[PDB]
Design a protein around this ligand. Structure first.
Ligand code: TDC
Ligand code: TDC
Ligand code: CL
Ligand code: CL
Ligand code: CL
Ligand code: CL
Ligand code: CL
Ligand code: CL
Ligand code: MG
Ligand code: MG
Lengths: 203, 203
């Protein structure tokens, strides 16, 4: 079928959604596209290049809150951004795994620059703004990964529980992870705020 | 060589450290142990079972701060716990990936029960204590994953940067991730504290 970037990525995303990140091999991608491997190699040199581009396209397709609204507070922006990031990562199987370790793509420069600039405009040093942004990303990535990967293990295989753990597992099995995610997100945001407002005060 | 649980795990950990989580196949494990695949299958039925046990053994070997000291504050415990968790996950290549999605093992029941009990004793509901513990784990897992996975991509492949992003990348390349990790950890902890102390107050 068609082998422009867009179609190669479409097909890769589809494949990722079926077989997960393990199953995203160049041989399997070639199979899905209906082509021979040297044909694919002309367009896609290895798994790594594919993963970088998938990371970018996942956000381009489904990350709709990349930018602060007019007059939006930094707290509100971080909140909306994190929820959108989460939604995008959950869209595809192992999407958070795909996103891991990446750096902003040229196509993401203006977006991430605006994010960073906006933090500094709200009183953060570049460093402290970056630390807050990173912590939000890491927390969100960790939550999504444990949610997605837990689900992959339940279909892989299936008491003596002490009571608090028994109940803690009941709490976790009664929700997809969103409740605990949103709770931790508020904690994290308020903590940045305490830090930011403290200035040079011991806090 | 010897095929008790301990030796199988030793060898798997070694293999993981060399080839990462992709390279941890039962065929390669058999090769390292010097055995045929049906021999290995008797001891290890699939990759999933191997991963669960590796998650457990990584913490057993290198997670030394699983339990609160006598009279230790919950804040201090969470801090020390998170640092220890991080250190354990960084010990092996893709260790954080190995740990993802798991649930406490029977061998971890008493430990995690004590953690949960200790939070409740310090004023948290079981739910809120769990939410704090989870957020710490997720944040820590996310940070380690992006640190480890970033490093794997630098050896996989190698300007037009706007200034804030340029500098943000300089900041990130000048440290292994620990500084930003420890900064986010304090934010997260203080946020739990604001939540906890607020009780029924609007906060
Ligand atoms: C500022 C920044 C960000 C990210 C990032 O990886 C990064 C980096 O690797 C080095 C220096 C700065 C950054 C994000 O991944 C990203 O997910 C992202 O690309 C991004 C985006 N493209 O919209 C975001 O929404 C941000 N958000 C999840 C906090 C975050 C912003
Ligand atoms: C309480 C709890 C924990 C963990 C966990 O996975 C979990 C769960 O899946 C369901 C319900 C409760 C828990 C941890 O993974 C673990 O990493 C862990 O096993 C653990 C340990 N074994 O010592 C920890 O140190 C904890 N810490 C990283 C916050 C955390 C505690
Ligand atoms: Cl074409
Ligand atoms: Cl295209
Ligand atoms: Cl606002
Ligand atoms: Cl033996
Ligand atoms: Cl043994
Ligand atoms: Cl203390
Ligand atoms: Mg990133
Ligand atoms: Mg866990």
């Amino acid at each position: 079928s068609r082998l422009n970037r867009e179609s190669v990525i479409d097909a890769a995303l589809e494949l990722l959604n079926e077989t997960g990140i393990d199953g995203l091999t160049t041989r399997k991608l070639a199979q899905k596209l209906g082509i021979e491997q040297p044909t694919l190699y002309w367009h896609v040199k290895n798994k790594r290049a594919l993963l970088d581009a998938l990371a970018v396209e996942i956000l381009a397709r489904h990350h709709d809150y990349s930018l602060p609204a007019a007059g939006e507070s930094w707290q509100s922006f971080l909140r909306n951004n994190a929820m959108s990031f989460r939604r995008a990562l959950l869209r595809y199987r192992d999407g958070a795994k795909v996103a891991l370790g990446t750096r902003p793509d040229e196509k993401q420069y203006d977006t991430v620059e605006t994010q960073l600039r906006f933090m500094t405009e709200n009183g953060f040093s570049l460093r402290d703004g970056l630390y807050a942004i990173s912590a939000v990303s890491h927390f969100t990535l960790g939550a999504v990964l444990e949610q997605q990967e837990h689900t992959a293990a339940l279909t892989d295989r299936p008491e003596n529980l002490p009571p608090l753990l028994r109940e803690a597992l009941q709490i976790m099995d009664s929700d997809d992870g969103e409740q605990a995610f949103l709770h931790g997100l508020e904690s994290l945001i308020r903590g940045f705020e305490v830090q930011l407002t403290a200035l040079l005060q011991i806090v």
